[PDB]
Amino acid sequence: SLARAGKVRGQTPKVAKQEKKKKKTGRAKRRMQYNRPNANS
């Protein structure tokens, strides 16, 4: 009954955090997004 807690969390593989270049912060990010969205098709 209470033994199935967190079953899915432990079952899925623990994919390591991939290396992503740091994104601009503050003023530079605001200017960048103005110059330029998640078209997954």
Partner: protein, 141 residues
């Protein structure tokens, strides 16, 4: 129809005060009975002791077994049911551990598929349960 005369203001204040005892929000707060009746006693949080670990069935449309904890509050000794918010934190928490209990929402009403359950669990053994879930901290040894 409603009175409009210029020398009836006392009637206006009386009719508004004796009809203010007719709405579920005003009368609930200004009778002093709701605050004496909730196990919190007007508390946004509370330090209680984990007594029992139980599994409660979800509502009719959902077939789920939530992980609630029966906790007795140190302030007045009320036995309440408090579901553990995040996944995997039921195994993170253990019995005989002091925890901090917070709200579910809806101003003291049951939220989601957990019937009769209004309480959430955080600050397990003086470390945040969100911290334990994210791995920021660990239980003291």
């Amino acid at each position: 129809g409603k009175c409009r005369g210029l020398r009836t203001a006392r009637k206006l204040r009386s009719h508004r005060r004796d009809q203010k005892w007719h709405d579920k929000q005003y009368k609930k707060a200004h009778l002093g009975t709701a605050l004496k009746a909730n196990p919190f006693g007007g508390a946004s949080h509370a330090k209680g002791i984990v007594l029992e670990k139980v599994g409660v069935e979800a509502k009719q449309p959902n077939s789920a077994i939530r992980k609630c904890v029966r906790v007795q509050l140190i302030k007045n000794g009320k036995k309440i049911t408090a579901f553990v918010p995040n996944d995997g934190c039921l195994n993170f928490i253990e019995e005989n551990d002091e925890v901090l209990v917070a709200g579910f929402g809806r101003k003291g009403h049951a939220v989601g598929d957990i019937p009769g359950v209004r309480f959430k669990v955080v600050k397990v053994a003086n470390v945040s349960l969100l911290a334990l879930y994210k791995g920021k901290k660990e239980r003291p040894r």
